[model samples]
Target chain A: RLFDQFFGEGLFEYDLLPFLSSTISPYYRQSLFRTVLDSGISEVRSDRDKFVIFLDVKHFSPEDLTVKV
Target chain B: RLFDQFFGEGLFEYDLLPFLSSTISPYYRQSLFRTVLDSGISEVRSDRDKFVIFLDVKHFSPEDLTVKV
Candidate 1:
């Protein structure tokens, strides 16, 4: 799963780069995003189907938290 | 106002600290969360009415993405 690959630890941290557009639905919302690397400042992936990550944020009240990736 | 103050950059980046609880409704889902900072690692805010942030993630299919904070 993309969640496990990219954001398994439960947090997403990356630089601000150019992304696609945006869309929303009654069921869920989505985005086409890509990441960049240093050294050459390269963009490795773009395809949404293969290169997509999910960061499911889950919060617990009174100072308890868990995130599903 | 929480969204603008905490997540106005359209992305949320924070450590895995303690939080409140989780609740999901038919129309939407919510999680009460808090952030951690340097200098002794303190828990600054807890009350929802006082310190709450909203991240509205809007996505379009086929490479389109937008997020509201």
Candidate 2:
């Protein structure tokens, strides 16, 4: 129902600004995210609630893989 | 704000001990981080900052995930 990081420090505003803008980024974000993890569910509405959130990092080993949101 | 890593060769204070105080694991504590996006309005404290912070992961196709503090 909510994303806590994308608000405080601008994950997109700061890091992703190089690629997309605030308005343009949200428009295509869901569609692009689905490309990576579209196995279980697919498709998303324009509403932010329709899109699930994820945190991805490969710096650790398989066993060390962790997900916290 | 900072990540805890061993300055020495290995983790957990060089794995110098055997168990318990020693930590036999040969690794320091590890933590995973995900992006947090939230409102500064009350529930999130409403700091009124003009930015957000997100990780390198996508948002849309997340299904099986775990979160630990």
Candidate 3:
């Protein structure tokens, strides 16, 4: 429900300002954010009490990506 | 330097446990993390006092993605 409230239409339908860290520069943040936005497809679905997010990223290995919460 | 310490060898050499939130379940975290790792090419570069991250994500539009810091 929390995710749905934030991403009701989709992940891209919301603003990232609330989630981005103020410690990071705007330029760098926008750059990194833009790159992510430009790559792949994403889908969100809820199963029972949990939410599942699927990202369609191709051409990279497990050793080349990192996800931070 | 903080980012370098966290992501020294690109973005995948480090353990993501420190960055992940304890609030989210391990199953969900790993699932989302795996999807990102499998989907693109990323490059990190430092320009003076700033850090630049480049994610090579293709086939999506600006309206189709979201980034959260």
Candidate with top lDDT is 1
Q: Write the residue-wise lDDT of candidate 3 on B16-36 in tens digits.
A: 233322221111111121112
Question: Taking candidate 3, what TM-score does its chain B reach relative to the real chain B?
Answer: 0.16
Model 1 C-alpha lDDT per residue in residues A1-69, reported as the tens digit of each score: 121122222223322332332222222223333332222122233222322335544533343334443
For the candidates in turn, chain A alone yields TM-scores of 0.20, 0.14, 0.17
Q: What is the per-candidate TM-score for chain B?
A: 0.21, 0.18, 0.16
B1-69, model 2: which lDDT tens digit per residue?
A: 332222232211222222322111222233244232223332212332344444784334434546777
* Alpha carbon lDDT at A53, candidate 3: 39
What are the per-residue Cα lDDT tens digits for candidate 2 across A1-69? 232121121122222212322222221111121111212233333322233345565453234355443
TM-score per candidate: 0.16, 0.16, 0.14
Which lDDT tens digits does candidate 1 get at residues B1-69? 111112221233322332432222122323333342223233333232332334444533342344434
**TM-score value, chain A, candidate 2:** 0.14
Best by DockQ: 2
lDDT of 2: 0.29
Model 2 TM-score relative to the real fold: 0.16
| Candidate 1 error regions (>4 Å) | A1-69, B1-36, B40-49, B63-69
Say which candidate scores most in TM-score: 2
Model 3 Cα lDDT, one tens digit per residue, A1-69: 121111221111122233322222111111122111322344443333433434555543333344456
**Residue A30 lDDT in model 1?**
32
Chain A TM-score, structure 3 = 0.17
